[PDB]
Amino acid sequence: HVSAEQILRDVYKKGQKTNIDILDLEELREYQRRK
Amino acid sequence: EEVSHFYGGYLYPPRCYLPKKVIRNYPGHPEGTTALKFLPKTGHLILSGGNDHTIKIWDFYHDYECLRDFQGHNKPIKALRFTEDCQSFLSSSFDRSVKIWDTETGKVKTRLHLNSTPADVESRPTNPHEFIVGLSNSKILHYDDRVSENQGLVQTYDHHLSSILALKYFPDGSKFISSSEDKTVRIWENQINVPIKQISDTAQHSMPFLNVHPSQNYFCAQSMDNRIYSFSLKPKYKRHPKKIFKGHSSAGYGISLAFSGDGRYICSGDSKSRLFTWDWNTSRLLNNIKIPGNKPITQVDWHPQETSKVICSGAAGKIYVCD
Amino acid sequence: KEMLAEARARLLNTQGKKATRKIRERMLEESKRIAELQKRRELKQAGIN
Amino acid sequence: KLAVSLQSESKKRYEARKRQMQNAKTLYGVESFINDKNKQFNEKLSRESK
RNA sequence: GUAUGUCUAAAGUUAUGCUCUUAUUUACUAACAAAAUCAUUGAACUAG
RNA sequence: AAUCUCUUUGCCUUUUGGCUUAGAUCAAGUGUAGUAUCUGUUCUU
């Protein structure tokens, strides 16, 4: 049987959903400036 | 002024398995190799380009020598593409020029002086006279070299909002796919400035590379999220929910992907000098061969007839063969 | 069945239009950032700093 | 030794909290939630019934 | 239809079970659309 | 005398950040299109 508890578990599963690298000083400066 | 040298026509042609190791290498391009393609249908020749501004054809068999060298660009090579008949190939360069080269005599059949970087070039599979150039200024230009009017520019596609990343025709040449820095993928009918399909999503990253699966039923796109997605080639062209290939690194690099001659496997380069390979049915990662040089391997291609020979290259310059 | 699907969809949402647009904008800003670094890396490899 | 002792105790505390968070993120029986923050809130509400 | 925001990309060079084909259901969105009863008449018109 | 993992206690450590007339009203729609989606059938597995 459907239940409110089941409905809300399905909502929880429905909602629960890149590693860039710094190669040099220029990219480090860009990253630090943004942060 | 263009130049060319011969060192030997060579265009006449003289179940897959996983590759396991690098069997041999070619000198490639000293400052880095930026383009690499096998000769269509038979794969007995390898066309490549790089940072030395040169283009080279290498024999895939016999002594593995370089047969012809083409020197007509003043800046690094950006893209290379063979025609349906192999009789010609297109080359694009950061010098804002696209040139059509006669594969055998190395003579330039056509020159296009563009006002923007030709990020990618492609030729119509059913008509070698038609070619499309994707520009950094976001427009896509369609040329028909037979037409002298306006240097043959027969159509302009302009719905993309940012630099074009990749171009890929449907195997029948009726439609072509385009990707852009605008984070969208679009399908176009030949010579009509109207995209018949648009592929975009919140989580979808820009796709720097596009290729078509040998069965002609799906196309694959390398994405900046270190994944490879797949899309149907039939109307509505929906994304395939399960055929997703993961494992490699590609963010920040235009890393090409290729399919085995029989379509049983899919493979791609890696930003950490490796060559990944996945099963086309389950998308499971079956191998990741380490390529010498310790540089990003951006170029990967699978031989159209061999059971397992693959070629790869990148910033290291040399070209490597895996089997 | 359609009533349940619509209910689950409306029960999931928690953020308004501005926050949702900020999410998509941050994703786009990241993809632009990576495209910028890709072009800069290609130029650097070609000796063009 | 002082710098290393402080680094190691910070590390130990950090990992202990990481494990505790994984446990909290996998326990069940709490009132229905729709996202992780809602789960943590319902758990906080449950701690008031003590 | 707005407010409003974003983009414009060479050079004017800084030295080193799980899916697919495809026929439907449902929802949302569309200043897109002159739609046949109830001497020719909604007709260029509506925005925070 | 020193580790490791349990259990309790303590700590709550991504653990609801204003106001007014519940701020107000609405939730009947054709064609075509776009996006998501549903059943079935072969196919994948």
UniProtKB/Swiss-Prot annotation, chain A:
Q: Which domain of life is it from?
A: Eukaryota
Tell where it localizes: Nucleus
Q: What does this protein do?
A: Involved in pre-mRNA splicing and cell cycle progression. Required for the spliceosome assembly by promoting the functional integration of the U4/U6.U5 tri-snRNP particle into the U1-, U2-dependent pre-spliceosome. Also recruits PRP19 to the spliceosome, as a component of the NTC complex (or PRP19-associated complex). The association of the NTC complex to the spliceosome mediates conformational rearrangement or stabilizes the structure of the spliceosome after U4 snRNA dissociation, which leads to spliceosome maturation.
- Other notes on this protein? Present with 2140 molecules/cell in log phase SD medium.
Provide the assembly information. Answer: Belongs to the NTC complex (or PRP19-associated complex), composed of at least CEF1, CLF1, ISY1, NTC20, SNT309, SYF1, SYF2, and PRP19.
The entry assigns this protein to a family as follows: Belongs to the crooked-neck family.
What's the name of the protein? Pre-mRNA-splicing factor CLF1
Task: Give the source species.
Answer: Saccharomyces cerevisiae (strain ATCC 204508 / S288c)
- Taxonomic lineage from the root: Eukaryota, Fungi, Dikarya, Ascomycota, Saccharomycotina
The gene behind this protein is CLF1
Whole-protein coverage range: 12 to 50 of 687
UniProtKB/Swiss-Prot annotation, chain B:
Keywords in UniProt for this one? mRNA processing, mRNA splicing, Nucleus, Repeat, Spliceosome, WD repeat
Keyword Repeat set for record: yes
The residues bearing each WD repeat, given as ranges, are: 28-68, 72-111, 159-198, 202-241, 247-290, 292-322
The record lists the membrane-crossing segments as none
An example of a Gene Ontology cellular component annotation for this protein is: nuclear periphery
Q: Where in the cell is it found?
A: Nucleus
A GO molecular function annotation here is: mRNA binding
Q: Report the record's Gene Ontology biological process terms.
A: generation of catalytic spliceosome for second transesterification step; mRNA 3'-splice site recognition; mRNA branch site recognition; mRNA splicing, via spliceosome
Extra remark: Present with 1630 molecules/cell in log phase SD medium.
Please describe the quaternary structure of this protein: Belongs to the CWC complex (or CEF1-associated complex), a spliceosome sub-complex reminiscent of a late-stage spliceosome composed of the U2, U5 and U6 snRNAs and at least BUD13, BUD31, BRR2, CDC40, CEF1, CLF1, CUS1, CWC2, CWC15, CWC21, CWC22, CWC23, CWC24, CWC25, CWC27, ECM2, HSH155, IST3, ISY1, LEA1, MSL1, NTC20, PRP8, PRP9, PRP11, PRP19, PRP21, PRP22, PRP45, PRP46, SLU7, SMB1, SMD1, SMD2, SMD3, SMX2, SMX3, SNT309, SNU114, SPP2, SYF1, SYF2, RSE1 and YJU2.
Q: What does this protein do?
A: May function in the second step of pre-mRNA splicing. Regulatory protein involved in replication and mitotic spindle formation and/or maintenance. Required for initiation and completion of S-phase and for initiation and completion of DNA replication. Might be required for the maintenance of microtubules. Essential only at elevated temperatures.
Protein name as catalogued: Pre-mRNA-processing factor 17
**Covered residues, full protein:** 110 to 455 of 455
Swiss-Prot record, chain C:
Q: Which domain of life is it from?
A: Eukaryota
Give the UniProt subcellular location, in the record's own words: Cytoplasm; Nucleus
What is the stated purpose of this protein?
Involved in pre-mRNA splicing and cell cycle control. Required for the binding of the NTC complex (or PRP19-associated complex) components to the spliceosome to mediate conformational rearrangement or to stabilize the structure of the spliceosome after U4 snRNA dissociation, which leads to spliceosome maturation. Its absence leads to an arrest of the cell cycle, possibly due to the inefficient splicing of TUB1.
Q: Further remark, if any? A: Present with 784 molecules/cell in log phase SD medium.
The entry assigns this protein to a family as follows: Belongs to the CEF1 family.
UniProt subunit comment: Belongs to the NTC complex (or PRP19-associated complex), composed of at least CEF1, CLF1, ISY1, NTC20, SNT309, SYF1, SYF2, and PRP19.
What protein am I looking at?
Pre-mRNA-splicing factor CEF1
- This protein's gene is called CEF1
Entire-sequence positions represented here: 149 to 197 of 590
UniProtKB/Swiss-Prot annotation, chain D:
Q: Which domain of life is it from?
A: Eukaryota
Where it sits in the cell: the answer is: Nucleus
Give the family from UniProt.
Belongs to the SYF2 family.
Protein task: Involved in pre-mRNA splicing and cell cycle control. As a component of the NTC complex (or PRP19-associated complex), associates to the spliceosome to mediate conformational rearrangement or to stabilize the structure of the spliceosome after U4 snRNA dissociation, which leads to spliceosome maturation. The cell cycle arrest of SYF2 defective cells may be due to the inefficient splicing of TUB1.
Q: How does it assemble?
A: Belongs to the NTC complex (or PRP19-associated complex), composed of at least CEF1, CLF1, ISY1, NTC20, SNT309, SYF1, SYF2, and PRP19.
What does the miscellaneous comment read? Present with 1670 molecules/cell in log phase SD medium.
Protein's recorded name: Pre-mRNA-splicing factor SYF2
Q: Which organism is it from?
A: Saccharomyces cerevisiae (strain ATCC 204508 / S288c)
User: Which residues of the whole protein does the chain here span?
Assistant: 163 to 212 of 215
